[PDB]
Amino acid sequence: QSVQVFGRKKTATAVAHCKRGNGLIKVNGRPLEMIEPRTLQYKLLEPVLLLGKERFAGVDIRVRVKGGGHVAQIYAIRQSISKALVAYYQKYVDEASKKEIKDILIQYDRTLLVADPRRCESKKFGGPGARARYQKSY
Amino acid sequence: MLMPKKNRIAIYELLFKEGVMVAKKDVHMPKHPELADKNVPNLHVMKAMQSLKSRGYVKEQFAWRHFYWYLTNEGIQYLRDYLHLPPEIVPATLRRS
Amino acid sequence: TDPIDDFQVNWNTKHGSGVTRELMRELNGG
Amino acid sequence: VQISKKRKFVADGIFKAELNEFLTRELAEDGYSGVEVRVTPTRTEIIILATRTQNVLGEKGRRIRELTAVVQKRFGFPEGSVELYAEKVATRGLCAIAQAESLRYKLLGGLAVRRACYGVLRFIMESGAKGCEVVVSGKLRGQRAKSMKFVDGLMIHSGDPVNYYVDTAVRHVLLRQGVLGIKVKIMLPWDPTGKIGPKKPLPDHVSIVEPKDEILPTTPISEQK
RNA sequence: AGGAGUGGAGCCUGCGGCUUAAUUUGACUCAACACGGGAAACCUCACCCGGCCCGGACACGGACAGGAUUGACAGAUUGAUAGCUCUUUCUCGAUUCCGUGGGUGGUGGUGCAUGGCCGUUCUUAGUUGGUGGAGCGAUUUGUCUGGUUAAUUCCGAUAACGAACGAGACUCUGGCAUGCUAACUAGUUACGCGACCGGUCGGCGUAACUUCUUAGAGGGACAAGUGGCGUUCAGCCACCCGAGAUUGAGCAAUAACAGGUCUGUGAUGCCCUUAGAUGUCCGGGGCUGCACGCGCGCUACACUGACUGGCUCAGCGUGUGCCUACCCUACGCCGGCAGGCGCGGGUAACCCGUUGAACCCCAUUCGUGAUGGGGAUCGGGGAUUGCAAUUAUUCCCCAUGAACGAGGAAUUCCCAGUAAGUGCGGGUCAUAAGCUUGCGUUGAUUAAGUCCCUGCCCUUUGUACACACCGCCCGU
């Protein structure tokens, strides 16, 4: 089923297909325990063990990713996982524990549900960068 | 112009087939865009136009490095005289009007 | 040529007196 | 033989600019004021708005036959398959280049600058226009460059609406003392439904419609049919 | 408070003077010095030149009708295969040749003669009527003590009231469309294609829904909600929801300059230019010079690291074509280096492309050095667009480790996806970037303040200035 509601950061995005499966989370043919930077795995296991590894009781989540930058994909892959968990937990099951885990991860941080609207600004001529300008000649 | 008179009259005939065309501003162009492969040097095309400018019966509206020919009734009369031909050869565009 | 205009432009020039006279001619007399 | 969209559109722009320049330098005396191009299947039509239509057409249309005879030999139009049209300009107060060329051929004839500028000013504000700026720079007399302005009525000087509510024309005058540069900027009043000014209202202004009256009986009543 | 730090180190179009005639230009206060969209065999040429040709044509008078060109195996040599004062005389017939004239030449000198043109005070917040009040009047008030604001933005005081241009507003947008028109140049899931008793493929499984990229309409964010300040107002500061509680830029006033451009222009003013024509047909040198001063910038001085290579993530774009070969560019053979032929892929989200890319993801000698930070300093060779790479200019292979131990005084630039690090793209373009213009990618403690020593001249004030201090002026 496709209850995917984006989950984004910068120009990279993730779509978290969710179904009633095995409880194994897959990221485009590779497990979330093994990602190319080899450094942000804790950033990926943060949501699940923050809310509880016991929650996944036969739910197969495959996230497909596309965009620029690896770390830019992260903070959205995990956002997509949290969105898929929210959609699953809103579709049928109760809300009291949903609100409990939501409060816990909201006090944990804010980049698990709501995307960062930030983006790279254009560069203005007459300088090397958007805000930096060349040196003054005396 | 170290150029034969028969070719000048040929240029006059080819112009008389119409009323006005345009010229490319260049003296190094071997041929003519309208008279392609007819042994008509572009520099001599502007030579002809500058000669009739000296006469005072033709003008130009030069634009974007392109001469824009003109022709007044006295000039058409002179060209139809030097061609030694009847004035019956009116521009074919009125036959396609 | 409108003498009001001529006075407006040339009042401070060498012909200021002349344009003043022409303006006065136009203003009153008909 | 197909060509990319960017290149074909830039070629169309080049072609239009070429026509604009050629017809502005060719028919300025005859009051040429604008060229527009339309396309029908295997046919190109060109309509030329002009202040002096009797002077842009000519006797029996012969000049047009001449005109198409010129263009057809420049831009690649095959003989006999192109026609030229002309419409009188609805008002000379909605286009700046018309009054620009008028100023050119009023000063080229020999005329004090101020007289022509004020004649244009009164012509424009008897046309219902909401503002006219004629800036003339050069050497009016003597050997010094003084820029004079002939400013009449209010005129917007910034923002987006300058795209449409203001129409501008730059021109040069070639006298025997030198060159006089003019800019004519004509503001278009608000004329929706009628093509004199822009259809859209001025974006920064608000108008409140008059109130709708009340009828409030103190004793309730019903209206059966 | 602080941040690449250019300044400190050898390599740049050009600067300012700098070996044998041409290394020459325009721009001396930023707002000229990587600027004129500027790395030049040729047209990169504004420049002694060696001169190949009149592209001097034509009113009026000609020895007036025999002036010349297309003469190339030649001895004819200063363009020889253009008879070059060449003994002999070869070539489309009055058409190049004779005079004050007129221009195909005006990138020749003055932008201190001018014109659109932008720099520029100005990207600040300034500017001006009407009616009313004051003054004989020029003028003044409005346009202000003050609070507020990014703002002459408002509030407030108020002989002013009401307005206008500018600011604001506008528009594209950055940012939520889970709602909606809807793709076969877009894309994940109903049955086997090569594997595991149910899980996993960009050769993809029959089946296919707009969630996942483009581009449409409408919506949404308003200091709207609460709290603390405030002349209790305009507003300011905190807080919950929310995608978003300052996304970035182009438009930008009245009026003006003696700021640069006549070397941008078929827009132009007496002088050299009257054909003895500062390139013009052909084209063989020139801004392509060496002693040094803080002109934008370049790779570094190292162990947060260059370095065997493992894994793998980009976004604007640019792309086969009018005197336009040359543009990207999927395989076989060869060739480390560039490249030969073919079946094809591309007018284009169909073709490269899933820009597999590129920075980083740290398993290799590395340890404080002249070797591996630091190709910055040698001679040879394959060769593709280039008749013409002479300063291997530009496509690489070997050897060359000079200097730099993060660099004085004066001192650029920087508040959020910013500075900064990082590569790809467009401009120039034989295929070309140390420059510039866009794009992504990675990505802060920098303080939410004051006017110092920097400018901007707003108010009060003085004036003998008004050509306005580069003024005026006194005396020997």
mmCIF file of C-alpha atoms (C1' of nucleotides) in Angstrom, chain A residues 1-2 4-6 8-13 15 17 19-22 24 26 28-30 35-39 60 62 64-73 106 110 114-138, chain E residues 4 6-7 29-33 35 174-178 187-189 198-201 211-213 241-244 247-250 295-297 311-315 354 358-362 410-420 435-443:
data_model
loop_
_atom_site.group_PDB
_atom_site.id
_atom_site.type_symbol
_atom_site.label_atom_id
_atom_site.label_comp_id
_atom_site.label_asym_id
_atom_site.label_seq_id
_atom_site.Cartn_x
_atom_site.Cartn_y
_atom_site.Cartn_z
ATOM 1 C CA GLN A 1 0.000 0.000 0.000
ATOM 2 C CA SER A 2 1.087 3.581 -0.733
ATOM 3 C CA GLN A 4 3.552 7.643 1.443
ATOM 4 C CA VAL A 5 3.531 11.379 2.181
ATOM 5 C CA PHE A 6 6.978 12.546 0.966
ATOM 6 C CA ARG A 8 12.200 15.373 2.433
ATOM 7 C CA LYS A 9 15.374 17.320 3.163
ATOM 8 C CA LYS A 10 17.100 19.682 0.695
ATOM 9 C CA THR A 11 16.626 18.454 -2.904
ATOM 10 C CA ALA A 12 16.828 14.756 -1.933
ATOM 11 C CA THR A 13 13.663 12.812 -1.100
ATOM 12 C CA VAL A 15 9.302 7.453 -0.399
ATOM 13 C CA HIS A 17 6.421 2.119 0.877
ATOM 14 C CA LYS A 19 3.059 -3.076 4.002
ATOM 15 C CA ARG A 20 2.347 -5.980 6.366
ATOM 16 C CA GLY A 21 5.608 -7.892 6.054
ATOM 17 C CA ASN A 22 8.593 -9.114 8.070
ATOM 18 C CA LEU A 24 12.809 -5.565 8.054
ATOM 19 C CA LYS A 26 15.087 -1.831 3.323
ATOM 20 C CA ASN A 28 16.893 0.519 -2.221
ATOM 21 C CA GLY A 29 18.270 -2.997 -2.015
ATOM 22 C CA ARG A 30 20.461 -2.415 1.044
ATOM 23 C CA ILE A 35 24.763 2.870 4.059
ATOM 24 C CA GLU A 36 27.513 4.356 1.888
ATOM 25 C CA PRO A 37 28.927 6.994 4.315
ATOM 26 C CA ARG A 38 29.171 4.262 7.009
ATOM 27 C CA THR A 39 28.673 7.005 9.617
ATOM 28 C CA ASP A 60 7.752 -4.412 5.700
ATOM 29 C CA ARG A 62 10.928 -0.335 1.676
ATOM 30 C CA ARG A 64 13.208 4.355 -2.270
ATOM 31 C CA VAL A 65 15.512 7.369 -2.343
ATOM 32 C CA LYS A 66 16.482 9.917 -4.976
ATOM 33 C CA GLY A 67 18.245 13.271 -4.863
ATOM 34 C CA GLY A 68 21.657 14.846 -4.377
ATOM 35 C CA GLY A 69 24.003 14.153 -1.490
ATOM 36 C CA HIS A 70 24.079 11.207 0.906
ATOM 37 C CA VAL A 71 23.599 13.125 4.161
ATOM 38 C CA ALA A 72 20.917 15.130 2.360
ATOM 39 C CA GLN A 73 19.094 11.844 1.752
ATOM 40 C CA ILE A 106 8.925 15.731 19.096
ATOM 41 C CA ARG A 110 11.695 18.279 15.075
ATOM 42 C CA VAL A 114 8.093 18.327 9.419
ATOM 43 C CA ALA A 115 10.536 19.020 6.600
ATOM 44 C CA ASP A 116 13.141 21.773 6.632
ATOM 45 C CA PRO A 117 12.037 24.415 4.084
ATOM 46 C CA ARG A 118 15.647 25.567 3.620
ATOM 47 C CA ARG A 119 17.276 25.545 0.189
ATOM 48 C CA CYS A 120 20.400 26.821 -1.543
ATOM 49 C CA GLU A 121 20.018 30.448 -2.608
ATOM 50 C CA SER A 122 21.220 31.872 -5.905
ATOM 51 C CA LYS A 123 24.542 33.679 -6.286
ATOM 52 C CA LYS A 124 24.643 37.404 -7.028
ATOM 53 C CA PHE A 125 27.015 38.716 -9.684
ATOM 54 C CA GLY A 126 29.782 41.132 -8.809
ATOM 55 C CA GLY A 127 31.197 38.742 -6.230
ATOM 56 C CA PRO A 128 32.595 35.244 -5.730
ATOM 57 C CA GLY A 129 29.537 34.112 -3.753
ATOM 58 C CA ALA A 130 25.930 35.035 -3.092
ATOM 59 C CA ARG A 131 26.786 37.300 -0.151
ATOM 60 C CA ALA A 132 30.583 37.574 -0.378
ATOM 61 C CA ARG A 133 32.008 40.273 -2.645
ATOM 62 C CA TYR A 134 35.463 40.812 -4.112
ATOM 63 C CA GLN A 135 38.219 42.687 -2.312
ATOM 64 C CA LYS A 136 38.305 46.475 -2.520
ATOM 65 C CA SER A 137 41.157 47.921 -4.560
ATOM 66 C CA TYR A 138 42.680 50.913 -2.780
ATOM 67 C "C1'" A E 4 38.197 32.027 3.273
ATOM 68 C "C1'" U E 6 43.614 38.413 -0.130
ATOM 69 C "C1'" G E 7 48.674 41.353 2.567
ATOM 70 C "C1'" U E 29 40.553 58.078 -5.114
ATOM 71 C "C1'" C E 30 37.346 52.716 -4.235
ATOM 72 C "C1'" A E 31 33.041 54.030 -8.377
ATOM 73 C "C1'" A E 32 40.462 52.255 -13.688
ATOM 74 C "C1'" C E 33 44.353 48.009 -12.428
ATOM 75 C "C1'" C E 35 37.899 46.003 -16.763
ATOM 76 C "C1'" G E 174 12.529 29.177 -2.300
ATOM 77 C "C1'" G E 175 9.148 26.804 0.779
ATOM 78 C "C1'" C E 176 2.856 22.459 2.545
ATOM 79 C "C1'" A E 177 -0.767 20.829 -2.683
ATOM 80 C "C1'" U E 178 -1.318 14.413 1.060
ATOM 81 C "C1'" G E 187 7.424 6.977 -12.175
ATOM 82 C "C1'" U E 188 7.042 2.488 -6.794
ATOM 83 C "C1'" U E 189 3.504 -2.803 -5.296
ATOM 84 C "C1'" G E 198 7.150 -16.686 1.919
ATOM 85 C "C1'" G E 199 12.017 -12.263 1.140
ATOM 86 C "C1'" U E 200 15.027 -9.568 -3.497
ATOM 87 C "C1'" C E 201 17.087 -7.123 -9.239
ATOM 88 C "C1'" U E 211 1.711 9.496 -3.642
ATOM 89 C "C1'" C E 212 7.152 9.148 -6.251
ATOM 90 C "C1'" U E 213 10.059 13.974 -11.103
ATOM 91 C "C1'" C E 241 0.393 25.457 16.456
ATOM 92 C "C1'" G E 242 1.978 25.787 11.356
ATOM 93 C "C1'" A E 243 5.570 23.793 5.621
ATOM 94 C "C1'" G E 244 6.433 28.910 6.163
ATOM 95 C "C1'" U E 247 13.285 33.105 0.901
ATOM 96 C "C1'" G E 248 16.554 36.009 -3.029
ATOM 97 C "C1'" A E 249 16.508 39.255 -7.038
ATOM 98 C "C1'" G E 250 14.812 42.552 -11.797
ATOM 99 C "C1'" G E 295 46.271 45.959 -8.410
ATOM 100 C "C1'" C E 296 40.989 40.980 -8.272
ATOM 101 C "C1'" G E 297 42.990 36.028 -7.685
ATOM 102 C "C1'" C E 311 32.249 2.035 -1.888
ATOM 103 C "C1'" U E 312 29.056 5.075 -4.454
ATOM 104 C "C1'" C E 313 24.813 10.722 -4.024
ATOM 105 C "C1'" A E 314 24.259 15.865 -7.887
ATOM 106 C "C1'" G E 315 21.458 20.680 -10.178
ATOM 107 C "C1'" U E 354 19.968 7.032 -13.514
ATOM 108 C "C1'" A E 358 32.630 14.630 -9.494
ATOM 109 C "C1'" C E 359 33.947 16.822 -2.462
ATOM 110 C "C1'" C E 360 33.755 12.930 1.679
ATOM 111 C "C1'" C E 361 32.882 7.855 3.324
ATOM 112 C "C1'" C E 362 39.941 6.985 5.285
ATOM 113 C "C1'" A E 410 48.284 49.643 7.184
ATOM 114 C "C1'" U E 411 43.885 46.103 6.250
ATOM 115 C "C1'" U E 412 38.913 43.189 1.359
ATOM 116 C "C1'" C E 413 34.621 40.197 2.398
ATOM 117 C "C1'" C E 414 30.730 37.365 5.731
ATOM 118 C "C1'" C E 415 24.705 36.618 9.302
ATOM 119 C "C1'" A E 416 21.349 30.634 7.476
ATOM 120 C "C1'" G E 417 21.360 26.389 3.571
ATOM 121 C "C1'" U E 418 25.127 32.327 4.706
ATOM 122 C "C1'" A E 419 30.531 32.397 5.057
ATOM 123 C "C1'" A E 420 33.448 28.698 3.915
ATOM 124 C "C1'" C E 435 38.813 35.178 -15.215
ATOM 125 C "C1'" U E 436 33.674 35.935 -15.119
ATOM 126 C "C1'" U E 437 28.665 34.185 -15.118
ATOM 127 C "C1'" G E 438 25.058 30.105 -13.206
ATOM 128 C "C1'" C E 439 24.560 25.367 -10.745
ATOM 129 C "C1'" G E 440 24.602 21.833 -7.489
ATOM 130 C "C1'" U E 441 27.265 19.164 -3.173
ATOM 131 C "C1'" U E 442 29.280 19.636 2.002
ATOM 132 C "C1'" G E 443 28.506 23.189 5.285
#
